[PDB]
């Protein structure tokens, strides 16, 4: 590893991680599952009605957006969503102990996973949660790769899975 390579981990954090997995879009679009989304992975609604999505957007941003936001607005919303995922983990009796047991990089993978799937979805992964607490990294990763979350949209989830396996940022290098 070069001096530069060793600096790479200090450039990576949960925000940079999700930014790569979710991308950045300033106009309403449909995600890999066909749900209306904007910014950095902000799910507006699961309704097929675009009108509902725009309504949710205006509520989320606080102005008349007509389906379009600024980069600064995308960032503020993203920060709010990241905070909600972290808070969702820490208050949950099932997820908190697992999260506490993890190293810093795998903690980012945990927040990412919750950001993507929500608290109850993640908390339902009983075997994976046990495997992670027991440092059974390869088993955890194989089991994550069986999930509908990963399988229906692999490109959004693949790096998170690799990150649970290795506890390094390697999956986010060389985009
Ligand atoms: F429990 C958490 F939050 F650490 C976790 C999230 N995904 C797997 N584990």
Q: Tell me, what CATH number does 162's domain have?
A: 1.10.530.40
* Ligand 1 contacts CB of residue 157 (under 6 A): no
The contacts of residue 174 (CB under 8 Å, 6+ apart) are none
Q: Which helix (H) or strand (E) holds 164?
A: helix 154-166
The contacts of residue 161 (CB under 8 Å, 6+ apart) are 141, 144, 145, 150
Give how many domains the chain has, as a whole number: 1
Give the active site residue among 4, 21, 31, 138.
31
* Ligand 1 contacts CB of residue 144 (under 6 A): no
- By what technique were these coordinates determined? X-ray
Q: Which helix (H) or strand (E) holds 71?
A: helix 71-90
Distance CA 46, CA 67 (A): 16
Using CA atoms, how far residue 147 sits from 75, 138, 144, 154, in Å, is 29, 15, 5, 10
Q: How many CB atoms lie within 10 A of CB 127?
A: 13
The ligand 1 atom nearest the CA atom of 101: 4
The contacts of residue 38 (CB under 8 Å, 6+ apart) are 25, 26, 27, 28, 29, 44, 57, 67, 69, 74
The ligand 1 atom nearest the CA atom of 89: 3
Our answer to whether residue 22 is catalytic in this structure is yes
Distance CA 51, CA 63 (A): 15
The contacts of residue 18 (CB under 8 Å, 6+ apart) are 40, 41, 78, 82, 112, 115
Q: Please give the DSSP secondary-structure letter assigned to residue 59.
A: H
Nearest residue by C-alpha to atom 6 in ligand 1? 110
Q: Please give the DSSP secondary-structure letter assigned to residue 168.
A: S
The ligand 1 atom nearest the CA atom of 164: 8
* Ligand 1 contacts CB of residue 161 (under 6 A): no
Resolution of the determined structure in angstroms stands at 1.6
* Ligand 1 contacts CB of residue 122 (under 6 A): yes
Probe target for ligand 1 pocket from 82, 99, 101, with the most ligand atoms within 8 Å of CB: 99
- Ordered DSSP codes for 84-125: HHHHHHHT-TTHHHHHHHS-HHHHHHHHHHHHHH-HHHHHT-
User: What is the domain extent for residue 101?
Assistant: 1-175
């Amino acid at each position: 590893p070069t001096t530069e390579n060793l600096y790479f981990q200090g450039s990576m954090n949960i925000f940079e991680m999700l930014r790569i997995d979710e991308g950045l879009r300033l106009k309403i679009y449909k995600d890999c599952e066909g749900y209306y989304t904007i910014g950095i992975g902000h799910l507006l609604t699961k309704s097929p009605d675009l009108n509902a999505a725009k309504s949710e957007l205006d509520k989320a941003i606080g102005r008349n957006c007509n389906g379009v936001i600024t980069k600064d607005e995308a960032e503020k919303l993203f920060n709010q969503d990241v905070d909600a995922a972290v808070r969702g983990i820490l208050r949950n009796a099932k997820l908190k102990p697992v999260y506490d047991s993890l190293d810093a990089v795998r903690r980012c993978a945990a927040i990412n996973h919750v950001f993507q799937m929500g608290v109850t979805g993640v908390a339902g992964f009983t075997n994976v949660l046990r495997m992670l607490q027991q440092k059974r990294w390869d088993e955890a990763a194989v089991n994550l790769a069986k999930s509908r979350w990963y399988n229906q949209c692999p490109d959004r989830a693949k790096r998170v899975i690799t990150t649970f396996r290795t506890g390094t940022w390697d999956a986010y290098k060389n985009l």
